[PDB]
Design a binder for this molecule. Structure first.
Ligand SMILES: N=C(N)c1ccc([C@@H]2Cc3ccccc3B(O)O2)cc1OCc1cccnc1
Length: 223
């Protein structure tokens, strides 16, 4: 996350860190004791999910670790266009809930009024390095018309755009799969955007979580 700052230790109990080959790959959101929601482009070998983390450089008494027993990619995910960029990860055992590990409720209403949002993650900061401490930034939802101009012909109804035209606050490499939180609900997932991150003209693109209510519930309830 670029042009942000450190989060407080108690504000992100739903945040997950996704590892592959010993390095941070993606963020994710705990949405149920057995399930983490992330971006479909985060599907990499032998994913390790970490819950209750704040500082990736230290061993924390609040942290829990799990391998993935089932990675469920949306059946209509299109890798070239990042359309329907959503994946459900079933954990090895139910997450042990605490003050620092809690699920985040999904925004089910696609007509939700709140445009005031926040993003978080351990992706690249303004200096180009990967932070040990999780970063936070307040950003806002950008109109469909504004985002369409930024990314001509690349925005579908399964995408939302959010950013900051004033200071360039934006998610970056390592943050994808991470949450876009508006009114204490999950509004989106970090999906893609421009390179370098933090343009004042091109906001970040997020998976529109409200479009996936039925699919998420049907996957979680599956036999
Ligand atoms: N600016 C954004 N909103 C943005 C946010 C997250 C990510 C990535 C996308 C990604 C791809 C593959 C595996 C993981 C990720 B992820 O964690 O963040 C990329 C982003 O912009 C494109 C980009 C690609 C490459 C370098 N810099 C920037």
């Amino acid at each position: 996350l670029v042009h942000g700052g450190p989060c407080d230790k108690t504000s992100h109990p739903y945040q997950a860190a996704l590892y592959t080959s010993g390095h941070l790959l993606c963020g994710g959101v705990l949405i149920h004791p057995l399930w983490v929601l992330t971006a479909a482009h985060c599907k990499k070998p032998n994913l390790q999910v970490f819950l209750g983390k704040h500082n990736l450089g230290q061993q924390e008494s609040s942290q829990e670790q799990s391998s993935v027993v089932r990675a469920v990619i949306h059946p209509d995910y299109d890798a070239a266009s990042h359309d329907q960029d959503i994946m459900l990860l079933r954990l090895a055992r139910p997450a042990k809930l605490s003050e620092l590990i809690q699920p985040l409720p999904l925004e089910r209403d696609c007509s939700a009024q709140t445009t005031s949002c926040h993003i978080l993650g351990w992706g690249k900061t303004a200096d180009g390095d990967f932070p040990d401490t999780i970063q936070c930034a307040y950003i806002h939802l950008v109109s469909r018309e504004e985002c369409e101009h930024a990314y001509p012909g690349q925005i579908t109804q399964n995408m939302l755009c959010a950013g900051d035209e004033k200071y360039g606050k934006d998610s970056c490499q390592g943050d994808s799969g991470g949450p876009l939180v508006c009114g204490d609900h999950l509004r989106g997932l970090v999906s893609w955007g421009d390179y370098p991150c933090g343009s004042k003209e091109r906001p970040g693109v997020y998976t529109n979580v409200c479009r996936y209510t039925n699919w998420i519930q049907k996957t979680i309830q599956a036999k």
